[PDB]
Structure 1
Amino acid sequence: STPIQQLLEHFLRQLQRKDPHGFFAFPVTDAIAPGYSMIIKHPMDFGTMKDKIVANEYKSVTEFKADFKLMCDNAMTYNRPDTVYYKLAKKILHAGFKMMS
């Protein structure tokens, strides 16, 4: 593993600790989220981010942060503000960017 892979594995571990229920662990299915795939053009989740680190697809911390923000933005687009998913997406977006400095 490269220096960037080691750092992103560290960041991903610290970000997933902020989602103890695993709401963001795996891709959102149309089965659990009616019409999700037709509303959200660029789905993202922590599991896909792990796969991209292992595949060495992140060539900068900037690219990794953009996928984390995408995941949070998707949840805040699809879910109404009064929902568990919206509130956790907003919480971990801010806390996550602070953690990564």
Structure 2
Amino acid sequence: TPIQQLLEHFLRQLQRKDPHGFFAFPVTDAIAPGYSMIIKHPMDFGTMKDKIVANEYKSVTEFKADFKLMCDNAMTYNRPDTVYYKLAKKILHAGFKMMS
């Protein structure tokens, strides 16, 4: 669909802000001790791609809520001085400005 074109572009633009791919793939408790108990609704760019391909977003509002959920979860789990926290808070605000 055309929403798919739109969302695929926003996705690729957001994902360029993450050159190490910190957000490319689901987090597992082995790389992030205690993650699945703290974060109740995990999200990552890969899951978001598949939701685009699968036509699950019906509006750009729904896509931006999963983006924010992904950055919210990183803020929550990771200590503020960490590359993870920094990059989540930075990309959350810039990606929302980019996609308005």
Identity of aligned residues (%): 100
- TM-score normalised according to structure 2 size: 0.99
Gaps of 5+ in 2: none
SS at match of 1:32: coil
Equivalent position of 2:73 in the other structure? 74
Using the alignment, how far apart are the partners of 1:18 and 1:95 within structure 2? 9
Extract structure 1 runs of 4+ deviating beyond 4 A.
Answer: none
Q: If the length of structure 1 is used for normalisation, what is the TM-score?
A: 0.98
2 CA distance for matches of 1:77 and 1:16?
A: 20
Does the residue aligned with 2:32 lie in a helix, a strand or coil? coil
- Structure 1 residue 35, shift from structure 2 partner: 1.1
What do the CA deviations read for 1:31-74 (whole angstroms, capped 9, x no partner)? 00001011000000000000000000000000000000000000
Partner of residue 83, structure 1: 82
Runs of 5+ in structure 1 lacking a partner?
Answer: none
Q: CA RMSD for the aligned pairs?
A: 0.4
Deviations 1:9-43 (A, max 9, x none): 00000000000110000000100000101100000
